[PDB]
Amino acid sequence: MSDKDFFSWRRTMLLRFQRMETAEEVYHEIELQAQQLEYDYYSLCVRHPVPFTRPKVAFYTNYPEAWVSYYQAKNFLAIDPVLNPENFSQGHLMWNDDLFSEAQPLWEAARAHGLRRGVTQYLMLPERALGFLSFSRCSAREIPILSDELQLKMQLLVRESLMALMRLNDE
Numbered sequence: 001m002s003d004k005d006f007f008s009w010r011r012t013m014l015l016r017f018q019r020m021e022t023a024e025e026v027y028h029e030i031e032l033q034a035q036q037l038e039y040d041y042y043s044l045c046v047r048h049p050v051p052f053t054r055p056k057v058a059f060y061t062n063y064p065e066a067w068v069s070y071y072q073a074k075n076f077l078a079i080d081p082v083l084n085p086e087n088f089s090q091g092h093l094m095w096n097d098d099l100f101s102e103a104q105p106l107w108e109a110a111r112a113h114g115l116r117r118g119v120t121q122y123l124m125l126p127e128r129a130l131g132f133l134s135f136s137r138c139s140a141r142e143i144p145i146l147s148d149e150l151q152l153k154m155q156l157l158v159r160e161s162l163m164a165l166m167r168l169n170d171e
């Protein structure tokens with residue numbers, strides 16, 4: 001207790017994110033922070049706009065293969081807002097039925113697979129890349145202001161994931 005205990009939590013995480021030594025452990029930590037609360041399932045999305053290759057996206061998740069196949073098979077990346085920087089009008093996204101009011105075949109399938117609500121972030125960097133994270137939760141309960149201690153920590157997790165993973169990946 002010294003008016004700075006939240007700064008010290010940030011300092012502790014900054015040290016841990018540097019000690020990862022890999023992009024894999026950087027993202028794995030932020031997803032383990034969801035699993036530690038027994039939420040449901042976790043997800044990362046990453047994109048490398050390389051000039052030497054055709055442009056590509058990578059993504060990681062503990063989701064059921066029936067959702068992961070169905071999402072890929074119909075190419076739900078075309079209709080999902082969690083990868084579209086224009087929807088992040090204050091740098092952040094929240095799941096309500098209103099947000100999914102066009103993405104109804106995303107929400108109905110996600111609801112069935114156990115992704116009963118979720119939480120989402122984005123960042124932009126002058127060094128390049130782009131990246132996103134989202135936690136799902138089996139608690140079908142409302143998103144208000146998310147919860148202040150989660151809403152700030154989410155902006156921290158997206159910053160440090162994008163920062164640590166960018167400085168490891170360079171693309």
Ligand SMILES: CCCCCCCC(=O)N[C@H]1CCOC1=O
Nearest residue numbers: 043059061068071080082110115
């Ligand atoms: C192939 C899976 C990619 C993982 C990245 C998240 C994609 C996803 O499942 N999004 C849905 C899940 C329910 O709400 C959404 O916006």
